[PDB]
Amino acid sequence: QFTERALTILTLAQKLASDHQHPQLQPIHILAAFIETPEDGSVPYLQNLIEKGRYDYDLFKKVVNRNLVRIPQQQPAPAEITPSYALGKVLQDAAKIQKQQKDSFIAQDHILFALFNDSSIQQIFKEAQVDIEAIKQQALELRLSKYAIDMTEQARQGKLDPVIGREEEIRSTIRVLARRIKSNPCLIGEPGIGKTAIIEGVAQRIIDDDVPTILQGAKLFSLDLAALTAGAKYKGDFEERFKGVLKEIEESKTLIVLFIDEIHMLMGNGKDDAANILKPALSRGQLKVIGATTNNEYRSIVEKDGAFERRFQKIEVAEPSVRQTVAILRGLQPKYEIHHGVRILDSALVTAAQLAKRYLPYRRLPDSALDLVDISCAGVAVARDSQNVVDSDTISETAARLTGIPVKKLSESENEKLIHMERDLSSEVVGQMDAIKAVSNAVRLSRSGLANPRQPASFLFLGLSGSGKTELAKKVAGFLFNDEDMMIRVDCSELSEKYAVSKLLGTTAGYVGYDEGGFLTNQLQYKPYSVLLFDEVEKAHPDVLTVMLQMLDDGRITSGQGKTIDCSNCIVIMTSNLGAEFINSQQGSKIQESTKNLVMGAVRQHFRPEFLNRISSIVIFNKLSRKAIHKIVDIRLKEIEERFEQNDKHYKLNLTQEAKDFLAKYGYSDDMGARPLNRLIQNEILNKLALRILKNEIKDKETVNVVLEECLEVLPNHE
């Protein structure tokens, strides 16, 4: 309500009445407060609203002293009985003045005004007009809130979020502030660590009296930026506002501590002493200041400056552990429950902190956790129309809503959603279910939270051309991501010694390009989870196969700009026809014992064991024999009709056994795989169709048939 100055003047009125042995407090006693001290600096006495306004301060001094003598000496017990309506009114008027003046606290000037407005000399011995405008002019020309927010006062008024763990850097802050020379601690570190949280923590220590007196009484402020630049128009007015503030904090008011969150706001512009320097210049005069900066910003300015370094103490701020993070979540739990009017489970705070670590490589634990909590609470606030925050489902869903990470979906229809991948993928991918199982296994591990967080599932598919290696990877991208083309197939065979940035390797800054690994690294960074496939890894230069070791184990991914992604939540497929020489032995459609060792033998002799050692499993896919392609032919024809834009006509697909057989016998070979089937259907079925379409004769529906080879029908509806 009141400034410390206003409280001082009022308090003095009261205590002077006690000291002078006076009964009820009168306007006289507040006037006594005004003339309480010889200090000229006291506006109520010499550098006055009276003296620099319209009248001799002595006129007023004698009004008051005459009156103080005039009031008779009382028993000490009533010496200050009450402010009564008289001082009640003055203080209330001071509040009316705040409203008129738009002042957040009662100023000693509001007391000077309100008293003067009500008052009149009570005796003929002295006379003076209440020159309201003169006293306002002088008040307005005298005396940080114009340039900063009083963080301490906000803290006194609550409006503050408590901290945990960071007490140690706060204690360090206090210890630095307590220093005689380098009085300025600075909070340096990653964004999101809690450096603002620390400065609020500092405000709490001030508020809570946990700070030695020399800092205990400090008034903490949020500085500059707006005051610094928004308040600017011309050369030198930065320095003017600076100097103004600095002077204010230099004197009288115990101490004021300024806080600078983003020091980068200073440092001039290539320095040039573009205002900023004044603070360092005057910094020797105690000027207790707390600052902060991102470690990389620190870097970008410490490298240039050197001056501020002698003014401040560098303080690294540690990131809290997951458990410590939970503690902050718990500390802020009531803030969140209040924020949205919802309950949150303690277990939610816990899972959020742990899961957040797993989820967000681009967020510090306190951000990632507070994000899940505030996001979840916000999510629930929408659900207020129906709820509260659930440790499992709410956290899982909001995380998934934002990052996809389907492993947290935990769908109620798990039968389709993973259990029957053997059936779903077999239908899409005809062939050994074992290849399918290798993938579904990985997927099931990811959903169950079992997949080792340090090993993105990865498989090496050994086969023949036309085997369906890529097909499987695309179909699982279909099943899992609802998009067969979501995946990034990779041209690893197309790889020599230059293989940098066009590949996952990215590019080095200082060299042309600040865009890197577009196809892989940037897209891998962009997609929260994914599918990655390597085409013909056996043909890739070994130096990249070596680079791949980085993410084959660990899942860690680092770019040429030094950025890290770490896609351990992705699945990787490597393909090769390396073992084709032994797969082609035909020793079982599914390669049998001994032969499989030769297939893998080629792999073992060719690739460094290190490559191989990091694969979740190396899988040999069965040749898709003629009896099996039978199914893919019917399936493929279905897909082919479905791919033809709008379904206006399209086939009845009467292959008859003869075209089923022609396709099976002509479009397939154990040494070419299934590839020629697609070529064959298109070469004959679609080409003949094209002729009927080309002529623009087809009217409705189309038919597949044979001539005894493959041959289409013509409709009775056309020529």
Partner 1 sequence: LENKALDAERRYDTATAADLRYFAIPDIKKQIEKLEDQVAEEERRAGANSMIQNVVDSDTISETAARLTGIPVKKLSESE
Report d(CA 31, CA 65) in Å as an integer: 9
Q: Which of 350, 570, 583, 704 binds its own copies (CB under 8 A)?
A: 350
Question: Residues in contact with ligand ATP, total (CB under 6 A)?
Answer: 35
What does the per-residue mask of binding to ligand ATP show for 519-548, with x meaning CB under 6 A? Answer: ------------------------------
Give the residue among 611, 525, 521 at the shortest CA–CA distance from 560: 521
Report d(CA 125, CA 123) in Å as an integer: 5
Q: How many CB atoms lie within 10 A of CB 87?
A: 24
Q: Length of the chain in residues, anyone?
A: 719
Residue listed under structure tokens 């300015």: 301
Give the residue among 33, 245, 5, 248 at the shortest CA–CA distance from 110: 5
Report d(CA 369, CA 472) in Å as an integer: 37
Residue 553 has φ and ψ, to the nearest 5°, of -100, 170
Q: Per CB under 6 A, does 370 bind ligand ATP?
A: yes
- For ligand ATP, which is the closer residue by CB, 172 or 575? 575
Q: Per CB under 6 A, does 310 bind ligand ATP?
A: yes
Element (H, E) at 533: strand 531-534
Q: Which of 674, 680, 681, 689 binds ligand ATP (CB under 6 A)?
A: 674
Q: Per CB under 8 A, does 370 bind partner 1?
A: no
Q: Which of residues 692-711 bind partner 1 (CB under 8 A)?
A: 694-696
**Choosing among ligand ATP, its own copies, partner 1, none, which partner's interface includes residue 431 (Cβ < 5 to 8 Å by kind)?**
ligand ATP
Q: Per CB under 8 A, does 365 bind partner 1?
A: no
Report d(CA 256, CA 4) in Å as an integer: 13
What does the per-residue mask of binding to partner 1 show for 296-335, with x meaning CB under 8 A? Answer: ----------------------------------------
Structural tokens at position 487: 């995946």
Q: How many CB atoms lie within 10 A of CB 511?
A: 10
What secondary structure letter does DSSP report for 50? T
Q: Per CB under 8 A, does 167 bind its own copies?
A: no
Look at strands 457-462 and 571-576 and give their pairing: parallel
Q: Per CB under 6 A, does 61 bind ligand ATP?
A: no
What secondary structure letter does DSSP report for 363? S
- Report the first-to-last Cα separation within the chain, whole angstroms: 97
Report d(CA 46, CA 41) in Å as an integer: 7
Write down the least CB distance from residue 24 to ligand ATP, Å.
50
In this chain, which stretch among 51-59, 70-78, 448-456, 670-678 interacts with ligand ATP, using CB under 6 A? 670-678
Q: Which of 31, 245, 430, 442 binds ligand ATP (CB under 6 A)?
A: 430
Write down the least CB distance from residue 466 to ligand ATP, Å.
5
Write down the least CB distance from residue 350 to its own copies, Å.
6
Q: How many CB atoms lie within 10 A of CB 305?
A: 20
Element (H, E) at 169: helix 167-177
- For ligand ATP, which is the closer residue by CB, 103 or 494? 494
Report d(CA 654, CA 255) in Å as an integer: 93
Position closest to ligand ATP via CB: 468
Question: Residues in contact with partner 1, total (CB under 8 A)?
Answer: 24
Burial class (CB in 10 A: 0-12, 13-18, 19+), 382: exposed
**CB of 365 closer than 8 Å to CB of 325:** yes
- Crossing angle of helices 4-19 and 84-101, in 10° steps, is 160
Chain centre to alpha carbon of residue 20 = 63
Q: Per CB under 8 A, does 79 bind partner 1?
A: no
Q: Does residue 196 have a known ligand-binding role?
A: yes
What does the per-residue mask of binding to its own copies show for 365-394, with x meaning CB under 8 A? Answer: --x---------------------------
**Choosing among partner 1, ligand ATP, its own copies, none, which partner's interface includes residue 197 (Cβ < 5 to 8 Å by kind)?**
ligand ATP
For residue 184, the cross-strand partners are 312
Q: Which of residues 589-608 bind its own copies (CB under 8 A)?
A: none
Structural tokens at position 17: 């009445």
Q: Per CB under 8 A, does 397 bind its own copies?
A: no
Q: Per CB under 8 A, does 140 bind partner 1?
A: no
Q: Which residues bind its own copies (CB under 8 A)?
A: 191-192, 294, 296, 303, 306-307, 309-310, 313, 316, 347, 350, 354, 362-363, 367, 402, 526-527, 561, 563, 645-646
Q: Which residues bind partner 1 (CB under 8 A)?
A: 342-345, 347-348, 350-352, 355-356, 359-360, 371-373, 375-377, 379-380, 694-696
Q: Which residues bind ligand ATP (CB under 6 A)?
A: 161, 163-166, 191-197, 307, 310, 328, 366, 370, 429-431, 465-471, 575, 577, 624, 632, 636, 674-675, 678
Q: What residues are designated binding site for ATP?
A: 189-196, 463-470
